[PDB]
Design a protein around this ligand. Structure first.
Ligand SMILES: [Ca+2]
Ligand SMILES: [Ca+2]
Ligand SMILES: [Mn+2]
Ligand SMILES: [Mn+2]
Lengths: 199, 199
């Protein structure tokens, strides 16, 4: 029983910050909805129907497969998009909590360096996927990238921040300019309080 | 070096058939150009600098890998896009040559069935990639699908038709409606004479 979560803001709340109303309508109301609906259809009457999204992602991931199952593809994307919406928010010059800032400075040298590494990872995922800031099982903060719906749950990592680099996430607003999208995302869209709360 | 081939028609020649001028400008002038340029930059001063695109694709493909090298990613996409532009063309109700029609009926039961299977493969490639009609090493025709830049050269197959299902190929004109794009492509855009010539 996957459900499409409401956005934590109006569909037009990110427009002045570089993610248009049109993008949120297509991305949330159609793409995320499809992962929920297709996920439910595929999961119905299987061993996975009882389970949490997290359990389904971890249980259906096939390590080393180029292509994952339909159940994985939809379950993982459902979870990813749910995090993504919460990781952004309205407001000019959103502030970074101390504990997060300190950890970023310690792991990357500076927030500016963190942001450059994150943007580089996003640009570097060839095809569809995600860039992430994760806390790994040693407690280290680091940048990762994944294909398609694959995500930090597949590696026993905790997602702190994710940025969708599937083309649908940015093509309306940035066309081919994935690097400008990533930069803008990090500078204007990220809700750092939500990021910090995942630590 | 790799060079960006000119389109075999004006940038606006497919607009009345459902692929806009804007799509061809971004897709050819920016995306394909990036594969050429990034390909060249990565190939410069390597073992591959002398070689044909085909040799580079076959030589750099890693069958045992989730992600391919930068050289592979760009070389394969350069080849794919070069084929793609020639596989489409202007004109309402473009002629399908007899030899191709016969071969499709022989392999798929009917042209309609071929088109359904091709569209299903395109819809079924989760994330970025390609749908193909190929002649395999037994000389039979079949439908395949591949991720990212992976293509029939990687499997000792001959590409007859490819349809780009990376989102940039359709998002301007169809947004999330990849199935409508595929249907339209098969109905209006394919230059069947170019397809037949590859047999
Ligand atoms: Ca809409
Ligand atoms: Ca017709
Ligand atoms: Mn998405
Ligand atoms: Mn393309």
């Amino acid at each position: 029983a996957f459900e499409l979560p409401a956005l934590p803001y109006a569909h037009d709340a990110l427009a002045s910050l570089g993610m248009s109303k049109e993008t949120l309508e297509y991305h949330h109301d159609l793409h995320h909805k499809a992962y929920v609906d297709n996920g439910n259809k595929l999961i119905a009457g299987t061993e996975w129907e009882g389970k949490s999204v997290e359990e389904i992602v971890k249980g259906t991931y096939c390590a080393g497969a180029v292509a994952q199952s339909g159940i994985f593809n939809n379950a993982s994307q459902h979870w990813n998009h749910a995090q993504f919406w919460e990781m952004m928010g309205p407001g000019e010059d959103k502030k970074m909590p101390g504990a997060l800032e300190k950890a970023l400075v310690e792991s990357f040298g500076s927030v500016a360096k963190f942001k450059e590494d994150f943007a580089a990872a996003g640009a570097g995922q060839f095809g569809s996927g995600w860039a992430w800031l994760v806390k790994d099982s040693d407690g280290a903060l680091k940048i990762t990238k994944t294909e398609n719906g694959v995500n930090p749950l597949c590696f026993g990592q905790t997602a702190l921040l994710g940025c969708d680099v599937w083309e649908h996430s940015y093509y309306i607003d940035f066309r081919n300019k994935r690097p400008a999208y990533l930069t803008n995302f990090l500078d204007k869209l990220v809700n750092w309080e939500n990021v910090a709360s995942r630590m």
